[PDB]
Design a protein around this ligand. Sequence first.
Ligand SMILES: Cc1cc(=O)c(O)c(C(=O)NCc2ccc(-c3ccccc3C#N)cc2)o1
Length: 304
Amino acid sequence: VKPNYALKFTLAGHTKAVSSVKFSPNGEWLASSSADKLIKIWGAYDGKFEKTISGHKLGISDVAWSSDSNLLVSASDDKTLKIWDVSSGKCLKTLKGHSNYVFCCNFNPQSNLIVSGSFDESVRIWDVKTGKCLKTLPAHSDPVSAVHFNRDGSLIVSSSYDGLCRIWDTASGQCLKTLIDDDNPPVSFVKFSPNGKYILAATLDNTLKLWDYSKGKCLKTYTGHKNEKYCIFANFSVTGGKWIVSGSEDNLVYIWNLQTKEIVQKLQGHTDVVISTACHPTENIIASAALENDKTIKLWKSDC
Ligand SMILES: Cc1cc(=O)c(O)c(C(=O)NCc2ccc(-c3ccccc3C#N)cc2)o1
């Protein structure tokens, strides 16, 4: 069985490179961030523009939703994160502390915490209620490319251009494990699987790898795409068939069979690097976003 994703909507409106797209947990919305310093909110099923949220002084690298779909956090080149009320568009908190570009962000499942990673090589854990930094982790010796909580929020994984993925205890801020091999090329993205037992990591040698967290060993490698430069988002698609979904520097969305590692689809449409993909929480829907020569988001749907 293969999926049959087909283009349903093209979401135009950003005036510069799109940097991230994320579906709200309740499945109703898509948020996008851009080098044009804006966040846009769109209908998840029809691609209908809903609103623009503005306030950052420089480009935005990432956006992430709270578990109740009411708040957004954005990570900016202006060295700050902002927490937004989605329904009003108001900035509730500005999180200051990083000394350089903030590249990545995520809420924990309870959504009382935010984790951020920065060009300043640190990982920070922030209290949502107060906006206070709770912990600064001396995580890496190069820019932090991604940060992600596991399904119960007890662990954080961080990745970096230094080649390591590190798993941290959220409560204590101590490192529990480093995912490491004989050779360790730059890691451009990392995330836990939805079941919490595995980690997906992208390296800048055109490879994605699935690691067993318990054993600290690689189980599967996915190749065929191009990724030598950019921090490209990848995903587990779990609503229908079990796929790995990623963008690519050949401007395609790649879909692999999780178990066999075979490419099952390549989605064509974007006219620049597909920097971000996201998978809808309940329906077989993928969102893809592209850089400056394209500036669009595309929504794709499959029966499978
Ligand atoms: C909560 C949630 C709901 C889902 O439907 C779902 O597919 C996921 C998930 O993490 N899929 C992703 C996923 C599924 C299976 C495996 C896997 C690979 C090799 C050997 C064993 C296994 C296992 N086992 C890895 C990742 O978890």
